[PDB]
Design a protein around this ligand. Structure first.
Ligand SMILES: [Mg+2]
Ligand SMILES: [Mg+2]
Ligand SMILES: [Mg+2]
Ligand SMILES: [Mg+2]
Ligand SMILES: [Mg+2]
Ligand SMILES: [Mg+2]
Ligand SMILES: [Mg+2]
Ligand SMILES: [Mg+2]
Ligand SMILES: [Mg+2]
Ligand SMILES: [Mg+2]
Ligand SMILES: [Mg+2]
Ligand SMILES: [Mg+2]
Ligand SMILES: [Mg+2]
Ligand SMILES: [Mg+2]
Ligand SMILES: [Mg+2]
Ligand SMILES: [Mg+2]
Ligand SMILES: [Mg+2]
Ligand SMILES: [Mg+2]
Ligand SMILES: [Mg+2]
Ligand SMILES: [Mg+2]
Ligand SMILES: [Mg+2]
Ligand SMILES: [Mg+2]
Ligand SMILES: [Mg+2]
Ligand SMILES: [Mg+2]
Ligand SMILES: [Mg+2]
Ligand SMILES: [Mg+2]
Ligand SMILES: [Mg+2]
Ligand SMILES: [Mg+2]
Ligand SMILES: [Mg+2]
Ligand SMILES: [Mg+2]
Ligand SMILES: [Mg+2]
Ligand SMILES: [Mg+2]
Ligand SMILES: [Mg+2]
Ligand SMILES: [Mg+2]
Ligand SMILES: [Mg+2]
Ligand SMILES: [Mg+2]
Ligand SMILES: [Mg+2]
Ligand SMILES: [Mg+2]
Ligand SMILES: [Mg+2]
Ligand SMILES: [Mg+2]
Ligand SMILES: [Mg+2]
Ligand SMILES: [Mg+2]
Ligand SMILES: [Mg+2]
Ligand SMILES: [Mg+2]
Ligand SMILES: [Mg+2]
Lengths: 84, 99, 25, 136, 64, 126, 215
RNA sequence: CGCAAGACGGACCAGAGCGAAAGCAUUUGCCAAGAAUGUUUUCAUUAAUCAAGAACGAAAGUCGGAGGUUCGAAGACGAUCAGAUACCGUCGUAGUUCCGACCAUAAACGAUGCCGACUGGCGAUGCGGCGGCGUUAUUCCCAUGACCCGCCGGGCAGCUUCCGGGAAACCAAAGUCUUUGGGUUCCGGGGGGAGUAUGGUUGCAAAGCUGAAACUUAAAGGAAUUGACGGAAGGGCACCACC
């Protein structure tokens, strides 16, 4: 801290290290993604921190798993961030 | 006036700790306020080790150690010169004495 | 102690006096 | 005082049980099983004042008195089991301990495997003395 | 209850112990097996190298 | 006994050596005469103790330098070693080579030659 | 007993060890010879000898004291059988040190014989070679899982065996050697032993089964 | 060598953890409870502090059963001493332990009400999450665990300094205060008489809660400084000290 930091224009890489509530505008750390299992072929889109066992609408018994944070996928291929 | 920041005791974030008896006084002090000492020494003395290592039945024998854990009340630990009273600012050293 | 024992002595005298009073009446 | 029918090279083994309290010290000695016993000498037999009953000299006077008796029968080498008082108490050997142990290595015997044995409790009963300890 | 005399030679003087500082700590050899060594407490003015005389070589005194 | 020279004996003997160093040899009986000539010591007993410390200091100064006496003949050999040293006519050279994270520190300062590279063992010190 | 010279009435004996051990001669005992009714062979049974391992195999470590009771005498020979192992004190006291976690377990089991054992185990977490934190503490669920594994392994290795095969595993301690490798994908656990074995119930005598061991 | 009983869970055990506080440590199982963390889930002011009232409340102590190993008020002796109704020693009742009812106190202490905002640096540490070069274990894997390097929450703490404050010891709060006002609850007014007298109330009892006045007095007290002393510690010294 230099006693002259300017707050209206924070660092584009520091603004992403502070907690989600504590940056100039609030912004979630979650995102949406299109999972694509091997085998049966559908493009079901899942939340990141899913906390539900989702299913592919077909030939899968499972598609992601709940954890303390981000869901862990079994074999889901693409999972592109959907970027809107 | 207050003499120690920690009241001469380890307890923080706790209500009670089970006591423990001194080893010579048989007093009754908290397990975190007592003065502990681990002692590891040969079962033989260093004067005798060359005589006992001379009349073994076996050729290679490394004699056993004696492990003992001691706890002292404060009065008995000061009467037995285990610790000494220290200068006022020299009271805030936590590192154990040099070997 | 001297506060402890003062308290104890006052307590025992108070007991004696209360007994005397309530036994008188 | 006959012994085994072999005495030439090998060593007929035994066991010591040095009990070394303050107040007094015992040098026992038994056979290899512990059950049957041989001469037993204690520091208070050798000295005539209570204050001396545990001292390095009273212990050195006892170790020899046991060594001569054992050598008289069959026992040439000895195993050692060293005892403090134990049982919610001192659990450190008294002043006779070191002194009796050297005093039979010097007087003929041969020392075997030496071990420490003293009753240590897993949280025993309440120790004598009072909550404020035995003050002096 | 019977032990012969032993003759030791002083090899080093350690310090002057005793309550009035009267006796002297000293380390001795044994003049038959120079391998042995004990620490003894003498009463007169020892120098270095002179032959003491021990009436019981088995003891080893450790303070005043 | 004692024999702990006082600070009035250890200050004469320090000035005298600074002023007269080329007379004060290494024996005591000649120094006992030089000191009697140069300064005024108002006693025989003091004169001898001063001239007896002078000899100690002289024996010591025929080794390395002592930290109370600045003599002329021993300054210049330090002045030399500060003016230059027997080691090099070249500089310790510009031709020296370094490793990553500094190539990019220069990539934003524009350097392009005389370097090297080695990505260090892959976790912090152990 | 202070009648004249009670040591001129004693007879010496031998003491052998079961045929798993190399040095099969433990030592000697002694006993008052047969008198009015207290026959000596009565007095030579139920004697427990505690014998370090090194005086049996001659090639293994000096801790691991075994115990041997006698069961019958055959002409100045005391024949003995397994009774339970322990560990010497100082080895134990010198494993237990600060900034660690001492994991312990125990089970009750039978051999294929009626020998009802009561085992004990002990293990200590490891400071990994590359560490910097001054402590090597385990959580509680990891401890619990390790205990489950330690009880499970230690029961398999006994239930399927006769007394002789389990003693043959105890001699080099293959048990702790196996557990140290099993519990390594939870917490490295640098030290594992079988600190004690107690014999609880033992079946009928069967002299012939005894002489199987000493054959 | 073996049997029985009751209490106690050492070493690991830490300026570590959990709980509203008192308090809580052998294994395994069952029962409900909880903080923190993650969230692009839901309701939409539901909140803070609280007279009256209410739950828990160490040890001792009371009442009725069961038990009774160790320790041990009272007590009986033995020493020590001028005396010793004490310190020390041997013995020993109530008690100490469990079940059911009472009791509501403690240096119950961080001697420091609770809720919210702002104001320096540094390393560690327990829980959760996220990112990352190696090493390591299992099936060669991936997943996961042990380690190593950072970041984010909230937690017990520590070092540091002319932020500032204070009578100072000292405190990152005991700061943002004569440049005085974020919200609200309990409570102090020189020292003693005195937590006494009395009235009420609760309790089987022991006692708790609420609680005066007459009268008497120039000080009682807090932090720090310099001495003198100590049957306190570390060095050193003298035949007006000793050996
Ligand atoms: Mg004070
Ligand atoms: Mg907490
Ligand atoms: Mg608190
Ligand atoms: Mg408390
Ligand atoms: Mg005292
Ligand atoms: Mg029990
Ligand atoms: Mg335990
Ligand atoms: Mg914990
Ligand atoms: Mg109220
Ligand atoms: Mg209670
Ligand atoms: Mg009670
Ligand atoms: Mg009642
Ligand atoms: Mg009863
Ligand atoms: Mg009495
Ligand atoms: Mg008196
Ligand atoms: Mg009396
Ligand atoms: Mg008494
Ligand atoms: Mg008693
Ligand atoms: Mg009460
Ligand atoms: Mg109540
Ligand atoms: Mg109160
Ligand atoms: Mg209060
Ligand atoms: Mg606040
Ligand atoms: Mg973590
Ligand atoms: Mg933290
Ligand atoms: Mg200031
Ligand atoms: Mg701070
Ligand atoms: Mg702060
Ligand atoms: Mg802090
Ligand atoms: Mg404030
Ligand atoms: Mg303010
Ligand atoms: Mg404010
Ligand atoms: Mg007032
Ligand atoms: Mg007055
Ligand atoms: Mg008052
Ligand atoms: Mg009041
Ligand atoms: Mg009233
Ligand atoms: Mg009322
Ligand atoms: Mg009433
Ligand atoms: Mg009032
Ligand atoms: Mg004051
Ligand atoms: Mg001193
Ligand atoms: Mg003198
Ligand atoms: Mg005089
Ligand atoms: Mg004299």
């Amino acid at each position: 801290m230099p006693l002259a930091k300017d707050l209206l224009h924070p660092s584009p890489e520091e603004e992403k290290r502070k907690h989600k509530k504590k940056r100039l505008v609030q912004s979630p750390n979650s995102y949406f993604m299109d999972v694509k299992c091997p085998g049966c072929y559908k493009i079901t889109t899942v939340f990141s921190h899913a906390q539900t066992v989702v299913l592919c609408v077909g030939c899968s018994t499972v598609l992601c798993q709940p954890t303390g944070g981000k869901a862990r996928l079994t074999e889901g291929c693409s999972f592109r961030r959907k970027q809107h | 006036t207050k003499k120690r920041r920690n009241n001469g005791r380890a307890k923080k974030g706790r209500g009670h700790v089970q006591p423990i008896r001194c080893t010579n006084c048989a007093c009754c002090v908290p397990k975190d306020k007592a003065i502990k000492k681990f002692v590891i020494r040969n079962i033989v003395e260093a004067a005798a080790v060359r005589d006992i290592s001379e009349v073994s039945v076996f050729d290679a024998y490394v004699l056993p150690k004696l492990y003992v854990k001691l706890h002292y009340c404060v009065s008995c630990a000061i009467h037995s010169k285990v610790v000494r009273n220290r200068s006022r600012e020299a009271r805030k050293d936590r590192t154990p004495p040099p070997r | 102690m001297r506060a402890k024992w003062r308290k104890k002595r006052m307590r025992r005298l108070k007991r004696k006096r209360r007994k005397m009073r309530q036994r008188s009446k | 005082s006959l012994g085994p029918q072999v005495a030439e090279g090998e060593n007929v083994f035994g066991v010591c049980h040095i009990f070394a309290s303050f107040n007094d010290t015992f040098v026992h000695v038994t056979d290899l099983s512990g059950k049957e016993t041989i001469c037993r000498v204690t520091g208070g037999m050798k000295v005539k004042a209570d204050r001396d009953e545990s001292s390095p000299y009273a212990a050195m006077l006892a170790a020899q008195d046991v060594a001569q008796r054992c050598k008289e029968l069959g026992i040439t080498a000895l195993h050692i089991k060293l005892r403090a008082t134990g049982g919610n108490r001192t659990k450190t050997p008294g002043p006779g301990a070191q002194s009796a142990l050297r005093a039979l290595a010097r007087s003929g015997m041969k020392i075997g495997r030496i071990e420490d044995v003293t009753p240590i409790p897993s949280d025993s009963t309440r120790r004598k003395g009072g909550r404020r300890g035995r003050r002096l | 209850r019977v032990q012969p005399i032993k003759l030791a030679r002083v090899t080093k003087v350690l310090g002057r112990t005793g309550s009035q500082g009267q006796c002297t700590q000293v380390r001795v050899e044994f003049m038959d097996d120079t391998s042995r060594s004990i620490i003894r407490n003498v009463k007169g003015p020892v120098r270095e190298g002179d032959v003491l005389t021990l009436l019981e070589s088995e003891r080893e005194a450790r303070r005043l | 006994m004692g024999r702990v020279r006082t600070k009035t004996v250890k200050k004469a003997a320090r000035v005298i050596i600074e002023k007269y160093y080329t007379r004060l040899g290494n024996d005591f009986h000649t120094n006992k005469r030089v000191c009697e000539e140069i300064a005024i010591i108002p006693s025989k007993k003091l004169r001898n103790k001063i001239a007896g410390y002078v000899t100690h200091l002289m024996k010591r100064i025929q080794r390395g330098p002592v930290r109370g006496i600045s003599i002329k003949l021993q300054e210049e050999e330090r002045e030399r070693r500060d003016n230059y040293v027997p080691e090099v006519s070249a500089l310790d050279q510009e031709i020296i080579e370094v490793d990553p994270d500094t190539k990019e520190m220069l990539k934003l300062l524009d350097f392009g030659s005389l370097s090297n590279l080695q990505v260090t063992q892959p976790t912090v010190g152990m | 007993k202070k009648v004249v010279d009670p040591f001129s009435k004693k007879d010496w004996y031998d003491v052998k060890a079961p045929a798993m051990f190399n040095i099969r001669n433990i030592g000697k005992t002694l006993v008052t010879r047969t008198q009015g009714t207290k026959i000596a062979s009565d007095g030579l049974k139920g004697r427990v000898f505690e014998v370090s391992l090194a005086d049996l195999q001659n090639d293994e470590v000096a801790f691991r004291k075994f115990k041997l009771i006698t069961e019958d005498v055959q002409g100045k020979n005391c024949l003995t059988n397994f009774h339970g192992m322990d560990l010497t004190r100082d080895k134990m006291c010198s494993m237990v040190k600060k900034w660690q976690t001492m994991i312990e377990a125990h089970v009750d089991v039978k051999t294929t014989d009626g020998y009802l054992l009561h085992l004990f185990c002990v293990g200590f977490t490891k400071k990994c070679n590359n560490q910097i934190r001054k402590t090597s503490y385990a959580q509680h669920q990891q401890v619990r899982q390790i205990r489950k594994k330690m009880m499970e392994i230690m029961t398999r290795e006994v239930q399927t065996n006769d007394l002789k095969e389990v003693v043959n595993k105890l001699i080099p301690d293959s048990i702790g050697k196996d557990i140290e490798k099993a519990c390594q994908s939870i917490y490295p656990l640098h030290d594992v032993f079988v600190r004690k074995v107690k014999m609880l119930k033992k079946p009928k005598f069967e002299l012939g089964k005894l002489m199987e061991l000493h054959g």
